[PDB]
Amino acid sequence: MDTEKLMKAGEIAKKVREKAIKLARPGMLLLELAESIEKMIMELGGKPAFPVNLSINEIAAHYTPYKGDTTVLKEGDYLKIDVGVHIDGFIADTAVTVRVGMEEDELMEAAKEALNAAISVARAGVEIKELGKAIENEIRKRGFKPIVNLSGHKIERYKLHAGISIPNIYRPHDNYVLKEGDVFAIEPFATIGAGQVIEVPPTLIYMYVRDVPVRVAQARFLLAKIKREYGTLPFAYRWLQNDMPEGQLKLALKTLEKAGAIYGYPVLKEIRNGIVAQFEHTIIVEKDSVIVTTE
After folding, report:
1. Cα–Cα distance between 271 and 276 in angstroms, integer?
2. Binding region
3. Which are the contacts of 52, defined by CB distance < 8 A and separation ≥ 6?
4. Dist CA 256 CA 213 (whole Å)
5. Residues annotated as binding site for a divalent metal cation?
6. β partners of residue 83
7. What are the angstrom distances between the C-alpha of 255 and each of 217, 262, 263, 267?
């Protein structure tokens, strides 16, 4: 495997990471904000893997803007920036919780420590759950609320949640062995609000899933065009918003939705508005160590 190249995926992913970071300042209208990042990734020719996430405050994830959006950050807005890019399949995912204009509060430390821990413990030839453990402990340590459902994942070429969910918990069933080539993105999310996250309207991101011969004209055309340019990875309403008469469009893939050619990730919301702490890094287990493609 060409982990070598893969790494680049994270390096750019970093380059963006770092930059995307400083720009997270009140007055930064997510829309512009995002875009900024996105094509900045494009600047290196880094192929994105999904759109730039900006869930913040109590919304877990799955929020990239669409044009028509505004939302300029307010200070302390516990912003979440999640970057994803790959290079012909070879993915990369790194995420940061950002307290807008302010400091690394205790919440921030936690999730970051979390990551840390898992890495420390991280070594090919381990039971996932041991990571899982590490994690919770760093959160019960700082006394907080991890998120149950929303956890890290194994990835494969061209496949985001290609599998094995490194939970932010020691689930005594994650008796799975990490090995040389196994590669995961450890996504530690925390909060204060109970511990879950929920599906939430709207959905700005969808992704192809299967060809179901369509009946409505430009629908076929959409899933066809969607197919062409995107394939398996996700995209936003924003991504298509520059392609037709607005409603006609939503409607379109919406029709496409139900037929089943694509799925649409809504948003997740910290079940009870708990501050969505969130930090992410992708690695690869090898043996005694592992490596951070997203430094």
Report:
1. 10
2. 62, 82, 93, 153, 161, 187, 280
3. 20, 34, 37, 38, 64, 81, 82, 83, 84
4. 10
5. 82, 93, 153, 187, 280
6. 94
7. 11, 10, 11, 20
Which tokens is 15 given?
């380059």
User: How many angstroms separate the CA atoms of 280 and 289, rounded?
Assistant: 18
Resolution (A): 3.5
Elucidation method: X-ray
What domains are defined for the chain? 1-194+272-295 (3.90.230.10), 195-271 (1.10.10.10)
Task: Write out 3-35 in H/E/C secondary structure.
Answer: HHHHHHHHHHHHHHHHHHHCCCCCCCEHHHHHH
Quote the CA–CA distance of 202 and 258 in Å, as a whole number: 16
The catalytic site residues sit at 82, 93, 153, 161, 187, 280
**Sign of the dihedral through C-alpha 177, 180, 185, 186:** positive
Binding residues for substrate: 62, 161
Q: What is d(CA 109, CA 62) in angstroms, rounded to the nearest whole number?
A: 23
Distance CA 11, CA 282 (A): 11
User: How would DSSP label each residue in 131-186?
Assistant: HHHHHHHHHHHTT-EE-SS---EE-BTTBTT-S----SS--TT---B--BTBEEEE
Residue 122's SS3 state is coil
